[PDB]
Amino acid sequence: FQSNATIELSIVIPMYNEEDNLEHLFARLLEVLTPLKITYEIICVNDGSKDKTLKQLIDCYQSNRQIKIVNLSRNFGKEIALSAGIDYAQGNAVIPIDADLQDPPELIHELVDKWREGYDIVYATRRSQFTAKMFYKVIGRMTEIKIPPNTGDFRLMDRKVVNAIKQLPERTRFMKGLFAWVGYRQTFVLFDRTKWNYWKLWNAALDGIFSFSLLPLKVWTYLGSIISLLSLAYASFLILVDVPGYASLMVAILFLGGVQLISLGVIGEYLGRVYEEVKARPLYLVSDLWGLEYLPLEK
Amino acid sequence: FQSNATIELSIVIPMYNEEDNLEHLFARLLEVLTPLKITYEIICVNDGSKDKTLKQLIDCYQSNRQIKIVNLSRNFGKEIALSAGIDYAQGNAVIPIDADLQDPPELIHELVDKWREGYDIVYATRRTWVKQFTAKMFYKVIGRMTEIKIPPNTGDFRLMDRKVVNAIKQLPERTRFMKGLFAWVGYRQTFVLFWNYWKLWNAALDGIFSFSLLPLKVWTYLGSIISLLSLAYASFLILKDVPGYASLMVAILFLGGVQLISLGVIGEYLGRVYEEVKARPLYLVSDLWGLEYLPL
Amino acid sequence: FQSNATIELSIVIPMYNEEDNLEHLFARLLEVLTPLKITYEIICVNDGSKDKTLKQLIDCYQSNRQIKIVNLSRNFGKEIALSAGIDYAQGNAVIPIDADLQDPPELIHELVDKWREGYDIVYATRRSRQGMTEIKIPPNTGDFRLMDRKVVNAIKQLPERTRFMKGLFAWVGYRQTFVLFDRNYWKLWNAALDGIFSFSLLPLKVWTYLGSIISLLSLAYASFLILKTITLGDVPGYASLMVAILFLGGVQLISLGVIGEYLGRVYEEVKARPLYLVSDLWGLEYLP
Amino acid sequence: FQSNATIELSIVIPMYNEEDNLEHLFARLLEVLTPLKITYEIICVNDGSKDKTLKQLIDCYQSNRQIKIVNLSRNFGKEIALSAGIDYAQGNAVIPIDADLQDPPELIHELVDKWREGYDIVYATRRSRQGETWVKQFTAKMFYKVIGRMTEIKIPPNTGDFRLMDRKVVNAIKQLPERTRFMKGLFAWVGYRQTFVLFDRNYWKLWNAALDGIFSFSLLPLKVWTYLGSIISLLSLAYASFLILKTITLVDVPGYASLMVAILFLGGVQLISLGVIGEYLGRVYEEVKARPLYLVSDLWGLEYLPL
Ligand SMILES: O=c1ccn([C@@H]2O[C@H](COP(=O)(O)OP(=O)(O)O)[C@@H](O)[C@H]2O)c(=O)[nH]1
Ligand SMILES: O=c1ccn([C@@H]2O[C@H](COP(=O)(O)OP(=O)(O)O)[C@@H](O)[C@H]2O)c(=O)[nH]1
Ligand SMILES: O=c1ccn([C@@H]2O[C@H](COP(=O)(O)OP(=O)(O)O)[C@@H](O)[C@H]2O)c(=O)[nH]1
Ligand SMILES: O=c1ccn([C@@H]2O[C@H](COP(=O)(O)OP(=O)(O)O)[C@@H](O)[C@H]2O)c(=O)[nH]1
Ligand SMILES: [Mg+2]
Ligand SMILES: [Mg+2]
Ligand SMILES: [Mg+2]
Ligand SMILES: [Mg+2]
């Protein structure tokens, strides 16, 4: 039989203290990936595990040519450990999976089908009010991806999308709004069996309007400027009408003293985002690699 | 029968939902470019259209070696879609053209002729007291050619030399080249003959903030000297006229007001710093037809 | 017998006016490094010395193949000259020491042993007395340490490598350990505050939320609680005016403190001027 | 004879409306450079001239293999036009001179001599003993604490714009945007081997550049004022927390004498905080801006950058 040096699919699994599930995960994944008759690879990212998960990963690495390990220097975030695996993931399609396996792995057979039709990004949302009517008109046409009962963390992305978001710091939080900005051909498939809180979803909306727009800063600059010209001109005219004494002296100082703190709020928020954009510090660090080559030190 | 590999002219056309005008656009442009006896290319930028404009593009691409398609991932806007096409245009001269042919394509013959005389940028300009005031404020900085400003003139129909495209290639302001960047790059400029001042002076403020630090510096010193006049007014005059409310409110209103536009000029420049340091690209290319991906 | 191309250990010594200690430093260093039977190199960084330190360095350079000199243009400081020496230092392990030998060179034999076991970073912290790791208050871990090649490469482009003991050692992770050896509380939390602002961004966000929610309590109380109760035509006026201008006028200064603090760090991150400048090199090549 | 391929000296001249002085400039410079018996080059930067200076430069370029022209797209500052010429200048030493010839060119023989002695930067400051006053002694005593023994290169009646710089110095500051104001403080930060040569042939801007220096090479104005503004904030918050927690009473203490002063003091310290914050924010924009420092329209006898 012949050989093929091109990888078509890459599954990335971040692991933190997953000593138990390695045998069942690899057996289930093999029973799902083998019938496809397509070359693949398994990127296992050890995220500073303490329960000897790495020792078991290396054992599966020795007896499986598809197992590749990315050992981080310490425990990072789950999203950061996922970004590290995607960086070391070669292949035309990338799909992340969880270790606890809340979603059936057999569903990848349906995701790759939509990818073969031409779709660059294919989500896997489960099937299960005024907010949904809102985001459909502004945020994204496919609001069912980020509905309360399911997050679009189970998805397939083409190589063009992974390459497009390689340098973006928002690739860590790709489901926070970056998916609606990158565009491309998107679709989803349906299936059945913390998060899910509406406070945590409007938190993603607030985190989205500040990250992909300058409106909160610009509309407050113009608003603060027009109330400033009203303040200075009315003070010059008041110093040459009605002088309500305390009914204005307290109102004015406590109004201006309060509006400056929220102005300093949006300034401090955007200043923190500008800092996070200019840091030379990477998202993660790789301690060891098994079955992979290091990324170029240019970065 | 000499095969020339160098592209002499580049026509860049951003298109969003121009399914109807494709037949007349490519045909009427051909009768203008053929008598020039000059190698050229047409860079057609698909800006996320839904009305199957891309399918009609690919059909024209299949039977025309000068048609090259740049398929964007989504709708990004006219200025960004134009910037994407200029990036993939490797010709000695670049000319952006609208698909609805608001300007006659025959002016290309006039644009290239003035370009061969040595001019690096050649424009194509059409022909109350606000018209006398606005035109007078701009000749002090714009220079010899200001007619590209005065309404309804827009310089979006122009010819730019390769040196000019390369000079503004990495600048984020290349999307709004007609917002002030044309007057900063300088070069040898000229034009050929053939609104809303609320938006015209909007670009004046957007230019003073983009190419200068004067509003921030001037207000920094202006707010600093009134801070010294402040602290000194309560430094020596506390060891001991007191209009009471006539100044307690005014000072509260005055000192609180000069800070609000101090945070305004700071908040404006801070947003510009974000737009300069953000890692998010200007656009994303979904597919390419007849072109290679960048960087080459 | 046979030549060896790869250097295994690198000793980095920042030097400022060390004309006298050179004879004893190089002799005692050779006494410690020779029994290791391991190829090494000594990177000597001249940090703008005013005495005859450089002349003695060149003399030792001429008769010793392991002495290499990095001459800085001017005096940049102990930390910057240390970063400059690590940049021009190749080898699997890097160990910085001082010219005045409060750091006994014999501990290198123990530092390399812990590194042989798999530890990527091995500290040489002094014993405390008085009254993992976390020895950063009593005498505390200093610039006496061993770092694997993977660790020095990971923080090569980071500006925080100058102050690696200010918090970067806790962020990089890796396998870490320390070794104890013998022979102010204000700087403790001065460096602790210097760490919570560089690797966290929480002091800015927490004060952003706090300053904004007290702005809502402020604005809501004066906009239409006072206007709604005096539209019919109060709390002690002077006491309320005084407590309002000083509470609001002072909390804004803390917001300006954290904003100015982070703005200065953004300037230090985007400035194009380098950290140091090399005037001459002896036994080394220029970078990049 | 034989041919040498390395350039030993580079003379950079920014030119703006120098049509008349070109004939006297190139001839007098050639009479100074020939006896040195070392290879050299003359980089002429056309800085958006409005007359026929460029046409005359091209004529000198056609008959002189040492004349090279850098034509900028438009008129920039003299600092920018000089930085553009240094970028296209290849050579072991670089010397910038003015076109109107305000300083004698014969000093090059002394600059190269000091350069061959080992000095990386050699200045040529004028010798003026006039204007000795107490203010000059104050400025000299305050600037000597940071600049060093070489600080004499900036008395009020002279600057250090006539200098020789080694290739290592021009390379060290090639990517720095502050190279246009190299004589505004950057010369003292590079710290290379420096000396000057003497020859005899406003205080507003001096301390203005010093104020620009403490902001350009330091963070003290921002750090000191944030610390100061914070400790007076602690005094303001605490003292007001006890003025509201003093329930042992119920109209005013000092009424207008203190309260009007209070809004004034807290309102003024914030304006200085906004002053230093806005000042450093503008410098951050100048460091992160993608807009280049200059643009080159044409080149004669040179290659475009990068190589
Ligand atoms: O610090 C962490 C935490 C999480 N994980 C990985 O992320 C998944 C988190 O699973 P969990 O059920 O807690 O999150 P959820 O299923 O709700 O998305 C696990 O498979 C871990 O392998 C990780 O690598 N590092
Ligand atoms: O979102 C858009 C809108 C405009 N266009 C193109 O930009 C040009 C603008 O022409 P239009 O007549 O629509 O605008 P106007 O003439 O008013 O300037 C047209 O060729 C469009 O194809 C585009 O690429 N994306
Ligand atoms: O400005 C300086 C001061 C320190 N050093 C070097 O750093 C080490 C620290 O020595 P020092 O005794 O001054 O530091 P301390 O003992 O107080 O920790 C010495 O080898 C010096 O040569 C230096 O290169 N430049
Ligand atoms: O806008 C300018 C002004 C100055 N110069 C050049 O800089 C030098 C300084 O000229 P000027 O005599 O006007 O300045 P000053 O002699 O007073 O220092 C001259 O050789 C000019 O060619 C320039 O290139 N562009
Ligand atoms: Mg789980
Ligand atoms: Mg139109
Ligand atoms: Mg010491
Ligand atoms: Mg002059």
PDB file of C-alpha atoms and ligand atoms in Angstrom, chain A residues 98-102, ligand 5:
ATOM      1  CA  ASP A  98     -13.763  17.786  25.205  1.00  0.00           C
ATOM      2  CA  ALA A  99     -12.367  15.053  27.435  1.00  0.00           C
ATOM      3  CA  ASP A 100     -15.509  14.429  29.506  1.00  0.00           C
ATOM      4  CA  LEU A 101     -17.309  13.892  26.168  1.00  0.00           C
ATOM      5  CA  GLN A 102     -20.681  15.558  26.739  1.00  0.00           C
TER       6      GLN A 102
HETATM    7 MG    MG E   5     -16.641  18.760  30.364  1.00  0.00          MG
END
